[PDB]
Design a protein around this ligand. Structure first.
Ligand SMILES: CC(C)N(CCCNC(=O)Nc1ccc(C(C)(C)C)cc1)C[C@H]1O[C@@H](n2ccc3c(N)ncnc32)[C@H](O)[C@@H]1O
Ligand SMILES: CC(C)N(CCCNC(=O)Nc1ccc(C(C)(C)C)cc1)C[C@H]1O[C@@H](n2ccc3c(N)ncnc32)[C@H](O)[C@@H]1O
Length: 329
């Protein structure tokens, strides 16, 4: 048996790979994961990048790369023992590193990715090469603080929950998934994610990947108490979207829902016939699309619970002037 090992930059257990190096799918294999890990650790640590003064099918050539990386790591650990300051260990991963870490967690967790169903509207042979970016855009645009609770509704193997948990301060992040196959992989994604984040010396916020149905009664109260919801509802039917509207109607003021299809018209106009529709209690905006993203770019929608829309309508009805105007129609 032959092996390649990469040392952890913070002294966790080394990553070990058998030779020949495994292929994970049509676009991912262990040789590129190794090269990319080396590259990313070099971004974490300048002196390492400096000190790194390649045929992926030659063992010797790949061992010469690993050896070189490992010797460089040893010398950086020595440097840290001296007066030099160690790497800050309390930090979150940059977006780029997080993309790599999640690909790596997915590689080791999702043993047969063909079993998982494609998430419309994204490409099926792409592994989040745009969904990852959209979520990244949202993480930046949506201020989240430690008083927030986050849910991804229908969370698959947990790819979005783990991204968001790596990046934000929400008190807790949840994913709820209904199907056996994705739920089982989520169990492993969790394990591998905790392990690889330790390996790179990075922190995440608390999260839980749970098995459940988000239309169940247990999730009624839980949706009600969530302040940020992500849901890729583009392919949902009108019955399921309707049931979600019922749940969203119980959210607290300021609650936010980001979706791929809006749950209410963007120019909702409140009157006697639409008094009970969800548009009476939320602002809806079309978010800024991300250049370099086909499906015409991917559009996405932010809803904010705001009952003052409804308060003003009722106040307007008490005013006989405004009341007469509305009765123009
Ligand atoms: C091969 C994998 C990626 N699989 C998609 C599984 C769901 N997507 C998913 O997990 N994306 C994802 C994965 C990782 C990340 C992170 C990087 C961790 C953030 C982010 C997003 C393939 C599914 O699409 C189908 N598929 C594959 C190729 C094919 C085809 N050319 N045309 C039609 N459908 C096809 C296949 O039947 C499976 O249902
Ligand atoms: C397409 C959605 C619905 N989902 C994707 C899983 C990965 N998460 C994901 O893509 N999140 C996400 C990505 C991007 C965005 C934005 C772009 C920001 C809008 C928002 C959210 C699919 C999973 O949801 C599950 N699902 C569907 C209904 C069902 C149910 N009632 N309770 C439990 N889980 C259920 C289904 O079994 C799949 O595993």
């Amino acid at each position: 048996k032959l092996e390649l090992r990469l040392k952890s930059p913070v002294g966790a257990e080394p990553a070990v790979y058998p030779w020949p190096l495994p292929v994970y799918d049509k676009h991912h294999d262990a040789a590129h994961e190794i090269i990319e890990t080396i590259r990313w650790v070099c971004e974490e640590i300048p002196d390492l990048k400096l000190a790194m003064e390649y045929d992926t099918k030659s063992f010797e050539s790949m061992q010469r790369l690993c050896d070189k990386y490992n010797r460089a790591i040893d010398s950086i650990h020595q440097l840290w023992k001296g007066t030099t300051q160690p790497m800050k260990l309390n930090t979150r991963p940059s977006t780029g590193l997080l993309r790599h870490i999640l690909q790596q967690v997915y590689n080791h967790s999702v043993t047969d990715p063909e079993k998982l169903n494609n998430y419309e509207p994204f490409s099926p042979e792409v592994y989040g090469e745009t969904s990852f970016d959209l979520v990244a855009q949202m993480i930046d645009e949506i201020k989240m603080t430690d008083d927030d609770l986050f849910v991804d509704l229908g969370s698959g193997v947990g790819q979005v929950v783990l991204q968001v948990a790596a990046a934000t301060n929400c008190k807790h992040h949840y994913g709820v998934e209904k199907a056996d196959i994705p739920a089982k992989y989520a169990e492993t994604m969790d394990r591998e994610f905790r392990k690889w984040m330790k390996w790179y010396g990075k922190k995440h916020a608390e999260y839980t990947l749970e098995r459940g149905d988000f239309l169940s009664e247990e999730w009624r109260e839980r949706i009600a108490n969530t302040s940020v919801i992500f849901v890729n509802n583009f392919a949902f039917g009108p019955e399921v979207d309707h049931q979600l509207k019922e749940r969203f109607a119980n959210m607290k003021e300021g609650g936010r829902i980001v979706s791929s299809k809006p749950f209410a018209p963007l120019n909702f106009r409140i009157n006697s016939r639409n008094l009970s529709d969800i548009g009476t209690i939320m602002r809806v905006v079309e978010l800024s699309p991300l250049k370099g993203s086909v499906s015409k770019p991917v559009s996405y929608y932010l809803h904010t619970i705001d009952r003052t829309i409804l308060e003003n309508y009722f106040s307007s009805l008490k005013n006989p002037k405004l009341r007469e105007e509305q009765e123009a129609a």
